[PDB]
Amino acid sequence: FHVKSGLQIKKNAIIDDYKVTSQVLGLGINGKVLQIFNKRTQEKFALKMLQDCPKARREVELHWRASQCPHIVRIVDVYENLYAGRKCLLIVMECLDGGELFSRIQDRGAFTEREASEIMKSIGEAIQYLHSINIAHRDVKPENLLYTSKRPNAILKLTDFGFAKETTYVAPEVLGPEKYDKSCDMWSLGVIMYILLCGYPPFYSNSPGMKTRIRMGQYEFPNPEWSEVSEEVKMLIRNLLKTEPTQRMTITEFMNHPWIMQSTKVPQTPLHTSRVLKEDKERWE
Amino acid sequence: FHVKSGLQIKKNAIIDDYKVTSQVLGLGINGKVLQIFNKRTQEKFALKMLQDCPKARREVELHWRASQCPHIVRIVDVYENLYAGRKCLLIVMECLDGGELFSRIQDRGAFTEREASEIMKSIGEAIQYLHSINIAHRDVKPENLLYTSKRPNAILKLTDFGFAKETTPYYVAPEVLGPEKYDKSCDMWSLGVIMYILLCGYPPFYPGMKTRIRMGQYEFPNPEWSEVSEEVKMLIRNLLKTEPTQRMTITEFMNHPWIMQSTKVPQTPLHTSRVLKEDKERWE
Amino acid sequence: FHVKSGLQIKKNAIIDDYKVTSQVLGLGINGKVLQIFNKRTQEKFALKMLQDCPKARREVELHWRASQCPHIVRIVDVYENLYAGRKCLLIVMECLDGGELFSRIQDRGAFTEREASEIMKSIGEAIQYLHSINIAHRDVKPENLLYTSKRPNAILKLTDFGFAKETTPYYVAPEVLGPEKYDKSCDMWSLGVIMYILLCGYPPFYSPGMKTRIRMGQYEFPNPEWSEVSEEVKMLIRNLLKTEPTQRMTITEFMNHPWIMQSTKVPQTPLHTSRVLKEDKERWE
Amino acid sequence: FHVKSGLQIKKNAIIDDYKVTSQVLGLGINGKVLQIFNKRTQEKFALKMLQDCPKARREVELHWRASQCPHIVRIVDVYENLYAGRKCLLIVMECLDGGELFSRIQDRGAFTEREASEIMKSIGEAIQYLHSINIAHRDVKPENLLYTSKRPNAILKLTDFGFAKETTAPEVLGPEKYDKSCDMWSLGVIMYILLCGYPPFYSNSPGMKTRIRMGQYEFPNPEWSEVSEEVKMLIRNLLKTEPTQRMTITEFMNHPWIMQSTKVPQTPLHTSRVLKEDKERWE
Ligand SMILES: O=C1NCCc2[nH]c(-c3ccnc(-c4cnc5ccccc5c4)c3)cc21
Ligand SMILES: O=C1NCCc2[nH]c(-c3ccnc(-c4cnc5ccccc5c4)c3)cc21
Ligand SMILES: O=C1NCCc2[nH]c(-c3ccnc(-c4cnc5ccccc5c4)c3)cc21
Ligand SMILES: O=C1NCCc2[nH]c(-c3ccnc(-c4cnc5ccccc5c4)c3)cc21
């Protein structure tokens, strides 16, 4: 018998409890994230500021539901305050000061296929939880994957529920409608996996002609980066990047794929990612 | 960085915390106001009783937002209780025992143009705050303006949000930033009617009254208005425009020199004080 | 920087510039095609006559757009004239006197699997261009596939846009970039049907119980015709003729298939097509 | 009898006639503006690239109609081409290499009340023309005001019809909403900046949004201490929050401060310096 507590929205002023700096930690889909400090405990946290409405209410609601998952940024508290005579949802979440996923990769000198497998597995676990409780994330990108600390054993966490949406013998179609909201995360996972293995996206710019290469599904595994990467992985990427949403792999089939399943049985083959990523600081702005 | 705390609705029985008398302190647009006493502290407060529904929820919500302003009656606590098997919003507010604005004026024996300017400025300040946070009061009348105490330095405060309504890149016109109808300009009319009474003791509008209002027929008759400066008559004339869009905005009003420099307005005495008691009859 | 010129509709009478014979060169979905001669140059061209309306305007507009592709019949000029007191779009296009695709195949005495691969690749290229500019052809059939000349190095070209229709950050999924129904996947079926006929000489769907065999997906690879054809090709055909539109292969997947990719590494195995086609002149009317 | 010619859209490829560089000359509301050169004549022009649709068709249509006005950027040619298999309106317009209005002010070391009057008058003329042919611009801002050359006698010209809209006793002759009066506000904002170097509505934010709807601004010293009460009064009247209380373009062009530009005091303004001294919060 597992129940978890529901969300108690705090109504007192947030400045009673926290010292709010104006150092920006990230730009969210609807409002920025600031650095804040626990007045009593001195410890550091992140504050996301949203203007109260049905949209913001849903973000908080869905995020809170997912907050249980180890690979989703944890909500610490939610405040409802008045800010310049308008209502506000202020979300306090744990501080992910390990930085973005591709910043950590970008800082070495090498990255291996086995480590890419481990990273993909923990992203996968976040998506798997979300899908199992009928939530599509709809915005799984590089900027939304951050690490808890700089320490080498930090946990990778998924952030930002600004685009998240609820997805609702007896066959699965006969148990509630459900459109393509979910399969759209599976594409993201494909795009991230591709970047993790070579350092660049599968879809380029040069650029209104990028938009067509995406709908056509024109990409490649060019050498030298991909010459080492096993056909088994390319085949997995090929399957997450199908242009037809229903041809795409589901999160359960993904988590059961042998490359993800047995992360520790994946060859230690080194990838170019680490260098290709710093060597290309320009067109990453 | 100013945040103010939001509204925490108490759910325990109000009678745990307050002794509720049944002395009526006023009749609100939707429910009366009773005198109550803090059980622990002995101190006196006012309780407004509302039946829970979307209407009452908005009154509380809007009033709480405005409660910060120094010239708006301060909400102390909001209770949600069961009263005769129905849900209830009970609002506890500070006690305004100085009485109504025109009751204080009515009790002397003289009132001056400069004081009228100081009164008008503090009503203005309440309206100014409301408008700035996108709330129209829609019911600014003599009965809604009360004083905190009888002491001569008491603050004047506005009450009753029963009619209040909400009114909704960097060089953009005000019309292109959200629709907004005439909700606000309607307070500006009240302000003109109050100002008129403040300076002479009777209203500017006396079934043929209904048409004099829509026509805009009123005057500044003597002897009351013969001392009053043309500058003030001109300001009243402009708040009482029958066409809502021709009417002055609350910012233009707070910037008008008569309101701006209250202390440079002539000390000229008005008839208000006497005309008001001399006319106790047709004020019921 | 590639721009190509847009469409200038000529308004002068077409008979100023061309001699119009009444030899019919084909029947289009909305108006027949006549043989005409350039008055000044003596050279031969084809004229398609359409009655001006939103439908005909779209054909011209879409055909002009695709006219740049090497494997699509080239539009020479478009006239807007009065014919019997009604407005008219007259389209002048290059003369494809090499005749229909299956007429050329039918005239030998043998056809090989490698040539079928080369034909399919060039039809594919036309579809690929169209899809990449968001146009579905919707009428890819034997009669719409003609050769430029009789000379053995002639180019195969696609005609008739009477059914053609338009089909409408940087990690964003293909579904989230505009709706789009099954218009395109319907060309992919035609490609399968054409490929099947090219390898054996008859259609996969035969002689009101035909209508049900198509929706059921009942067809075979009967002997003796199909006994030489590699399992690789049968598998590609099986995948284009999927009854469920979304299970069907996309044009990019198709142009990447090794059988199409390396036309010149396909076995030179002879097919029955050439003979089966003339031997069955009857039920082809 | 004055007829002017209508718009002939050229259908041939633009690269036949022009050499198209990719030096960006400005960012428009729907597509950027590039520097191009007349292949035959060597002369320089600006190209705006739009994707064909009803929106872009209207921009070109409305712009063409206003192109006659001396104070509106002149369209040279309009091409309809295929770019990556999609149709395209390409607009060639005269090259305004004198740069933006506030860049030219920002480059001296002084600006006078009389010159501000002359600038406001020529912006007003553009709006006046547009309104008289029933078009509201709806996007009169600092970036849309450019000069033809650097030469000191250059003409100031208005650009960008991406937001322009057609606007159809005076009330009995066709409906018409507040489209027009919204240009009149821009005119006030621009006049304010021209006289002191900063906007009337600040950031430092979500509280700027409310100061605009409330109409809270001032004429603070030292900048405004020389500026005549007559001008402050005109600005006050363009910046009325109520659109119908706002002055019309005809009333504006008739105001004595605009009418007799050359009888306006030569009083120097702070604008020139306040503008460079505040390069930061202007990005
Ligand atoms: O919801 C979101 N969307 C936009 C991106 C984002 N970051 C966060 C976030 C959450 C918790 N911590 C951080 C954070 C903390 N400290 C950092 C230090 C250095 C780099 C990045 C950091 C991010 C960011 C939340 C969101
Ligand atoms: O919202 C309202 N509706 C209608 C009028 C009103 N009066 C009040 C009010 C609020 C607080 N205190 C008082 C009050 C208290 N004590 C008094 C003593 C003597 C005369 C008047 C008094 C009013 C009235 C609230 C409202
Ligand atoms: O759009 C169309 N509608 C359906 C059939 C068609 N044929 C053509 C066409 C176009 C250009 N040339 C020809 C042509 C010319 N000469 C031929 C000689 C012998 C056989 C077929 C021929 C076709 C046909 C166009 C269309
Ligand atoms: O439609 C528009 N909207 C966005 C801004 C813009 N600039 C232009 C424009 C038009 C003509 N010339 C230029 C131009 C020419 N030369 C320049 C030199 C230096 C700086 C800016 C320049 C702009 C810009 C049009 C538009």
Side-chain angles (χ1 to χ4, degrees), chain A residues 9 11-15 20 49 80-87, chain B residues 1-9 61 64-65 68 129 133 166:
Chain A
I9 311 252
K11 298 286 165 66
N12 68 290
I14 189 167
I15 60 169
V20 178
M49 272 210 58
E80 187 196 271
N81 290 175
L82 280 172
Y83 178 54
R86 271 193 280 166
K87 260 182 149 164
Chain B
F1 209 95
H2 304 18
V3 299
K4 296 284 213 201
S5 62
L7 181 56
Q8 182 64 85
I9 309 249
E61 232 283 275
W64 172 253
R65 229 124 76 53
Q68 298 187 44
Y129 182 74
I133 66 173
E166 256 186 297

Side-chain angles (χ1 to χ4, degrees), chain C residues 111-127:
Chain C
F111 194 51
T112 67
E113 194 183 306
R114 178 176 315 169
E115 295 162 55
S117 171
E118 274 158 13
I119 294 169
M120 283 315 302
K121 171 168 188 184
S122 74
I123 299 172
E125 278 184 22
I127 305 303

Side-chain angles (χ1 to χ4, degrees), chain D residues 11 43 45 53 111 118 127 176 191 211 232 235 240 273:
Chain D
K11 297 287 167 66
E43 198 182 359
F45 291 96
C53 62
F111 193 49
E118 274 150 13
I127 304 307
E176 181 163 330
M191 196 186 295
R211 290 198 298 278
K232 287 178 200 190
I235 295 166
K240 288 192 164 286
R273 193 191 53 250

